[PDB]
Design a protein around this ligand. Structure first.
Ligand SMILES: [Mg+2]
Ligand SMILES: [Mg+2]
Ligand SMILES: [Mg+2]
Ligand SMILES: [Mg+2]
Ligand SMILES: [Mg+2]
Ligand SMILES: [Mg+2]
Ligand SMILES: [Mg+2]
Ligand SMILES: [Mg+2]
Ligand SMILES: [Mg+2]
Ligand SMILES: [Mg+2]
Ligand SMILES: [Mg+2]
Ligand SMILES: [Mg+2]
Ligand SMILES: [Mg+2]
Ligand SMILES: [Mg+2]
Ligand SMILES: [Mg+2]
Ligand SMILES: [Mg+2]
Lengths: 188, 177, 260
RNA sequence: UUCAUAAUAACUUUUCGAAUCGCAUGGCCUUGUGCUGGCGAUGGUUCAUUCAAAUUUCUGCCCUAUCAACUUUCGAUGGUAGGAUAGUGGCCUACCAUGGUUUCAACGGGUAACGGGGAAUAAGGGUUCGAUUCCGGAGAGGGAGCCUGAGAAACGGCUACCA
RNA sequence: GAAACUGCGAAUGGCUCAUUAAAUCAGUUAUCGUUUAUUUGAUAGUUCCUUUACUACAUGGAUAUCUGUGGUAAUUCUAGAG
């Protein structure tokens, strides 16, 4: 019943438009997903023209991507620490798009270990020659190593759990991460 | 009140009228799906046991399973539910329905006999109603026969013969799958 | 209206089906198909009205059902099939073959055209795109989706579908000095040569057309269908070749060519 | 154009990828129920096309100032992010900015106003009418709410209130 | 070939002008801002996952129609059994 038509809004001038027609079905709006953490529970909704949509309330784990070396891994979302729209979602741990969450960060860790093996936080000849060809080029910046030692990664979600049903995003990295720490240090 | 007893294995059933206030007393406060001994419902019902599966109120309203109420209530039924058949697709209808708890307001009690008793009923414990038609799907026929599947189930289909008065003619189902 | 509309009142039918404003409340709404209903022509109109082979709806239904109509080499047993421009209608009875081309008055005229050329069809390229797995394809005006076309076939161009296999046989590249047909507006049925194609950055291309009689007009590019090279049309143009004689010239034609 | 498309990494309470029907049942001989085999009918993912559907730009509306300021705490104008949407969009939320229209008549009031193609009238200019044979819109007693579907806020579909 | 299940339409058509004064509508644009049954044209080997043990010569269970027992004063009311 939640309409999104422009009729109920006043005109640009400000006049109160009289009711022209009772609100249609191609103008409907549905309830907010306001997703949570834990015990995956996705509800399908049959929208216009079939095309199943998936409400992703109570989602615990999802895919997350690392842009620098560009590798994606399934990992667990562990709480939300910042939301650019409403901090009330942060206090209620409501997970929507562009929210900022923490990551278990292990899968990235042993992927790094089996990929470069730099022993963060502080063999076959083929692998050794691959590492030699790499030539310690894995000079990833210091702050991500800091939270790797902490163990929880700072990721920003990019998928829309309200529509898609998935929980995908990317790690804050580069100046991105910097900016948000400032905001987080404002919270701190 | 009227009691509609049904034996499944014989496939038989009957209606029984009871007027005493005390045989039906045990039926009180018993919800659908429960089991009540036959000793307490009739001296001729020794050894018997009754599963209670639905009924009809004195106003004709049936009792829906899982209402857990001794009274009637208005419910919004749809496809999938009982006590309602939808005409249009997705046609929800708000209809009255009696609760699942048996009370004095009931007029018919639908009752399955589960355990064969001591004294036999007239045509229920004794007689057997034949199945009106056998299996149709090929593997269903094989299972109903235990036919060692690679045995050409083609011929083993049942064949019902009917006589027109002048011509005897056979009619047998088509086997699917 | 809530949903699609499935009735076409008689006055609302195009003035090129050019039916009778009386003797009926409704008109045949063309079913969904290869052509726009405003631009198409239902088979019932083409048979009952244009050809008079039938008499009414039941007769057209009986004609179509017994599989004597063949639209572009396919049966098309539905009464309101939108047989559009340049489609080919084959009747094995009377062994006759028609190709729908507008007569210069701007109407779907009955064009009895030979069997040998009835094998193929012409089409205008309306889109050239790259479908899944990097496979190039071309969409014509019929909605035919020809896969793997010639690499230098571009939009607005024309192609010669063999109509049997349904693949590309030859094609004509759109450019100045080229025989052309018009398929919309006042210039329906007109045939000429492209003199200039003014670009008009931002939309709605225009082309100037000069016919054999040395008359000149201008028409939208969506409205244009290259038909061949001057003096060598790739199809059999209808009677009159779309010169658009003036009303006084038509009167002189009536007076001069006159035998009773 | 971040388009079409392709590629890498991954993801999925893992969609589709024919366990479906009719007719004719030919050819090969590996001569068996063996191997293949035509014309269709229904389905079926995606991309097009068509019927469309939603929105959408500019300009155009009758009388009234004895309606001169109107709109914003309850969205009024804009920004950003999110939610919802099939999708853009204050469409809704959170936080900001204080904005938008107006003597070129805004806002309010009236319409025994549905808009239009058109009708009457006719030197020319016009005046009045247009509920109704076509195109649009809206409605099914007044109101709200919703299932099914591609498409309904349907009413010869349901739910509730009011009469 | 009844009935019923399945599929599809029932959102077309027909009627009325009550509401509505930048609202509808008309002409003209846009969708590189979206959904689209149907019609038409194309469209897919991978469903194996360690392939040296599987139904692919065909996998499972219900379910209406029907057979019989009812209820209500009655309604396109339908509960129980096979
Ligand atoms: Mg209508
Ligand atoms: Mg893209
Ligand atoms: Mg936004
Ligand atoms: Mg008017
Ligand atoms: Mg009125
Ligand atoms: Mg009117
Ligand atoms: Mg009136
Ligand atoms: Mg109308
Ligand atoms: Mg309506
Ligand atoms: Mg009335
Ligand atoms: Mg449908
Ligand atoms: Mg309604
Ligand atoms: Mg009515
Ligand atoms: Mg109606
Ligand atoms: Mg109904
Ligand atoms: Mg007003």
């Amino acid at each position: 019943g939640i309409s999104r038509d422009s009729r109920h809004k006043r005109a640009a001038t400000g006049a109160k438009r009289a009711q022209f027609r009772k609100k249609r079905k191609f103008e409907l709006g549905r309830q907010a997903a306001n997703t949570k953490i834990g015990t995956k529970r996705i509800h399908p909704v049959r929208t216009r023209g079939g095309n199943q949509k998936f409400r992703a309330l109570r989602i615990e784990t999802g895919n997350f991507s690392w842009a620098s070396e560009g590798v994606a891994r399934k990992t667990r979302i562990t709480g939300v620490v910042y939301h650019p729209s409403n901090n009330e979602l942060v206090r209620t741990n409501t997970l929507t798009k562009a929210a900022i969450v923490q990551i278990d960060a292990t899968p990235f860790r042993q992927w790094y270990e089996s990929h470069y093996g730099q022993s963060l936080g502080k063999t076959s000849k083929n692998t050794e020659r691959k590492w030699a060809a790499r030539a310690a080029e894995a000079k990833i910046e210091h702050a991500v190593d800091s939270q790797f030692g902490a163990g929880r990664l700072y990721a920003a979600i990019s998928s829309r759990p309200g529509q898609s049903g998935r929980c995908d995003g990317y790690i804050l990295e580069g100046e991105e991460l910097a900016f948000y720490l400032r905001r987080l240090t404002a919270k701190k | 009140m009227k009691l509609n007893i049904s034996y499944p294995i014989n496939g038989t059933q009957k209606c029984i009228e009871i007027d005493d206030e005390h045989r039906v007393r045990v039926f009180y406060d018993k919800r659908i799906g429960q089991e009540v001994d036959g000793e307490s419902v009739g001296d001729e019902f020794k050894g018997y046991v009754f599963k209670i599966a639905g009924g009809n109120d004195k106003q004709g309203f049936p009792m829906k399973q899982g209402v857990l109420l001794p009274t009637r209530v208005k419910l919004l039924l749809a496809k999938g539910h009982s006590c309602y058949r939808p005409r249009r697709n997705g046609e929800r209808k708000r209809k009255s329905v009696r609760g699942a708890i048996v009370g004095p307001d009931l007029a018919v009690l639908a009752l399955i006999i589960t355990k064969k008793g001591e004294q036999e009923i007239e045509g229920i414990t004794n007689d057997t109603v034949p199945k009106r038609l056998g299996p149709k799907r090929a593997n269903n026929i094989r299972k109903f026969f235990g036919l060692t599947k690679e045995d050409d189930v083609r011929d083993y289909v049942i064949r019902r013969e009917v006589t027109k008065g002048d011509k005897s003619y056979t009619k047998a189902p088509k086997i699917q799958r | 209206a809530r949903g699609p509309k499935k009735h076409l009142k008689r006055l609302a039918a195009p003035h090129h089906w050019m039916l009778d404003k009386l003797s009926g409340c409704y008109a045949p709404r063309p079913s969904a198909g290869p052509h726009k209903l405003r631009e198409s022509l239902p088979l019932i109109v083409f048979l009952r009205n244009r050809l008079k082979y039938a008499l009414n709806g039941r007769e057209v239904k009986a004609i179509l059902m017994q599989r004597h109509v063949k639209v572009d080499g396919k049966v098309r047993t539905d009464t309101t099939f939108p047989a559009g421009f340049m489609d080919v209608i084959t009747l094995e009875a009377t062994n006759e073959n028609f190709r729908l081309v507008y007569d210069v008055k701007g109407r779907f005229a009955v064009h009895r055209i030979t069997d040998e050329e009835a094998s193929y069809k012409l089409a205008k390229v309306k889109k050239v795109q790259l479908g899944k797995k990097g496979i190039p394809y071309v969409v014509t005006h019929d909605g035919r989706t020809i896969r793997y076309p010639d690499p230098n076939i571009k939009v607005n161009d024309t192609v010669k579908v063999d109509l049997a296999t349904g693949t590309i046989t030859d094609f004509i590249k759109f450019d100045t000095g080229k025989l052309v047909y018009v398929t919309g507006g006042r210039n329906l049925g007109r045939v000429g040569t492209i003199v200039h194609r003014e670009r008009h950055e931002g939309g709605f291309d225009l082309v100037h057309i000069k016919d054999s009689l040395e008359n000149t007009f201008v028409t939208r590019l969506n409205n244009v269908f290259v038909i061949g090279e001057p003096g060598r049309p790739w199809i059999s143009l209808p009677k009159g070749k779309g010169i658009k004689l003036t009303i006084s010239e038509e009167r002189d034609r009536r007076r001069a060519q006159h035998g009773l």
